[PDB]
Amino acid sequence: VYAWNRKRISNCVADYSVLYNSASFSTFKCYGVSPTKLNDLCFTNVYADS
């Protein structure tokens, strides 16, 4: 957690519907996006912290 993996994501197609409907995630808490209506929104870059 103190050396969390950092990933830079862009230049591709994001399908968050499968992630939302995966049902394998105990917590899916969104502060800054809605769980739905995220497919038609896109930005300059995406940062992933694992």
Partner: protein
């Protein structure tokens, strides 16, 4: 009805979730409330209750 432990949070108005979207959706202006009690001695059995 009968739900599981993490399903308690999803049974609430304005709360997102797969079950809250496909099974039981509460209205935004819902008036009333929810009473949930443990039933480990009635709805649970050795070998699995399905």
């Amino acid at each position: 009805f009968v739900i599981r432990g993490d399903e308690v949070r999803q049974i609430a108005p304005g709360q997102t979730g797969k079950i809250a979207d496909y099974n039981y959706k509460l209205p935004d202006d819902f008036t009333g409330c929810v009473i949930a009690w443990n039933s480990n001695n009635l709805d649970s059995k050795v070998g699995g209750n399905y």
